[PDB]
């Protein structure tokens, strides 16, 4: 027979189980390093509504070792989740969040309609309605200066043909599945060519 012979736990639990999450317009970036990562349990549970890896297999992820794992967590509507993909143009890609085409990442989305959606609506979540230029990949902008769609300058005040760059998200239970919010986590892997802080 063959004889193959947990401990440190990468903190995916904070990333996948939080009551409130950073808004898409400004998102916290978390680096996961120096821990043992098991992705088999996450896939087997299938608690998330969809488990998606564009260039990788979920069973392969636990066996594979990535020295640095980067988790980007934000709450966006289901239609926005379809827009967010590497190598795919999206309204989110144009403004608040940009994905590098060369980069390959796992995007995992689970419905947050039960908790995030409110009858009043949740204004804690926010998105960027418009931006003067496309944001750099893996970067966020906090500028509140009015977007100058009109030739005449906005001058930092609301005006005809002037639209505020950031618009507060509105999430309700009676909204459609695409309108309803989905929590999304994006994973970036350093993989080879780096000291192996994380071992599968």
């Amino acid at each position: 027979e063959s004889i193959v012979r947990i401990t440190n736990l990468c903190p995916f639990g904070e990333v996948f189980n939080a009551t409130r999450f950073a808004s898409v317009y400004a998102w916290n970036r978390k680096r996961i390093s120096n821990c043992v990562a098991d992705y088999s349990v996450l896939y087997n549970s299938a608690s998330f509504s969809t488990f998606k890896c564009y260039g990788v297999s979920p069973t392969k992820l636990n066996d594979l070792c990535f020295t640095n794992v980067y988790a980007d967590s934000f709450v966006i509507r289901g239609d926005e989740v379809r827009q967010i993909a590497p190598g795919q143009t999206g309204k989110i890609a144009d403004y608040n969040y940009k994905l590098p085409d060369d980069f390959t990442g796992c995007v995992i989305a689970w419905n947050s309609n039960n908790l995030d959606s409110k009858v009043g609506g949740n204004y804690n979540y926010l998105y960027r309605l418009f931006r003067k230029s496309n944001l750099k990949p893996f970067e966020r902008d906090i500028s509140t200066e009015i977007y100058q769609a009109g030739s005449t300058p906005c001058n930092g005040v609301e005006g005809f043909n002037c639209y505020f760059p950031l618009q507060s998200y509105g999430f309700q239970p009676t909204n459609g599945v695409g309108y309803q919010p989905y929590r999304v986590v994006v994973l970036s892997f350093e993989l080879l060519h780096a000291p192996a802080t994380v071992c599968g």
Partner: antibody
Amino acid sequence: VKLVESGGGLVKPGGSLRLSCAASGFTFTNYGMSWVRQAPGKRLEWVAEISSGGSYTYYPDTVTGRFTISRDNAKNTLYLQMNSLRAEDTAVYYCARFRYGGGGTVDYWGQGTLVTVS
Amino acid sequence: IVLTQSPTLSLSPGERATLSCRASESVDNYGISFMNWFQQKPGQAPRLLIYAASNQGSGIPSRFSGSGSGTDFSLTISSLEPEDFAVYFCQQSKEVPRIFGQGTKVEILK
């Protein structure tokens, strides 16, 4: 588009009357559904509810409806099982289809439901 | 919350029908667009008119137009028709089970 409902039937007060709402023409998942009574001489009183993602089953605190909404997305069918039936339950219930996120909104409804408890 | 409407109108064709939806407690929306308008044909299923009073479109004829102000919502029908009037409703939202308008009907003389 339209809704097919569970029509007129009579029970004594105190029971539980199942309703049913069939969906004709739309995707029953993507729409919050509901049941809303119009009784004569009564304004529409928003009663029964369901969300499009999970189960919300929201009812007005007022006097508890005790309604048992479910969804079958294979049937596209909403139910209203109204526990603790009473004579006042006699009314026109409307299983209604919510539109996409907005001011309300309820563009499409059932044809009206005869429900009588007396 | 709870709302009120202008009770009724009695009018003639080719006229404006102004209907208040008067909400107790909260006024409309923090996103500044809420309440609603609804019509129920007599002895018939209710039907949408306007959501957030500013809005909609096809299925709601152009004679339905208007806005709302704080609590009050204006259901405004210019060019009335004796065929087209039926009990009109609005909804609250964002607070309470969203309830509805107490209902309003515009009579037409002539």
